[PDB]
């Protein structure tokens, strides 16, 4: 249904993370951050709208049936497992390290 890529991102703090997610369906795509030991709190929804409490470093933008999550200036509280969801279907996840 939807393929998330890459499986793993090796990134140092301060770099910009781009997490891609392709889908064959038209739906709002949300992005969830799973910090180890914590619930996967919502990062963005509708493909570009930030959830309350999320810093403005998280955004999305792309054209066509494809989404990209851009995470600038990664901090020590990031580097979790990121998931894309469209209409109940979840991407395999990208581990950010």
């Amino acid at each position: 249904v939807l393929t998330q890529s890459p499986g793993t991102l090796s990134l140092s703090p301060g770099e910009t993370a781009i997490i891609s997610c392709r889908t064959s369906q038209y739906g709002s795509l949300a992005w969830y951050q799973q910090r180890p030991g914590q619930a996967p709190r919502l990062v963005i929804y509708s493909g570009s709208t930030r959830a309350a409490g999320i810093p403005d470093r998280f955004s999305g933008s792309r054209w066509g049936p494809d989404y990209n999550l851009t995470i600038s200036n990664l901090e020590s509280g990031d580097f979790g497992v990121y998931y894309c969801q469209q209409y109940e279907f979840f991407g395999q996840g990208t581990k950010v390290q």
């Binding site: 709002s28 619930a39 996967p40 919502l42 998931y83 969801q85 979840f90």
Partner: protein
């Protein structure tokens, strides 16, 4: 403040049944769809189902049909996920979630603490 409090840390052998409770607060339980998601480690996470507690209407994921049942109480605002015929592929952290805006359930802003199940 919306909060979902789940009981968990349950270990089961293949073939046993399990029940995970989810107590909800901070919103009207009747008026908002609650979702059960199975975050299997190392595997694509799966959304097990949704439960509309007003009438208790439920929608289970097709791969789980016949093995997953969801129930609830509305006088103690609690949802229940019950699984039967557990196998080794059911090892996962199970979450109870609620959407940011109840009109759209899928964007899940409120998550429970997480209930690991080892099989």
């Amino acid at each position: 403040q919306v909060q979902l409090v789940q009981s968990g840390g349950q270990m089961k052998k293949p073939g046993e049944s399990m029940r995970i409770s989810c107590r909800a607060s901070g919103y009207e339980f009747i008026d908002c769809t609650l979702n059960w998601i199975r975050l299997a480690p190392g595997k694509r996470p799966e959304w097990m189902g949704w439960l509309k507690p007003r009438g208790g209407a439920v929608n289970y994921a097709r791969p789980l049909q016949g093995r997953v049942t969801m129930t609830r109480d509305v006088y103690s605002d609690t949802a229940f996920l019950e699984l039967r015929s557990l196998t080794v592929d059911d090892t996962a952290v199970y979450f109870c979630t609620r959407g940011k805006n109840c009109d759209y359930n899928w964007d899940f802003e409120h998550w429970g603490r997480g209930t690991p199940v080892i099989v």
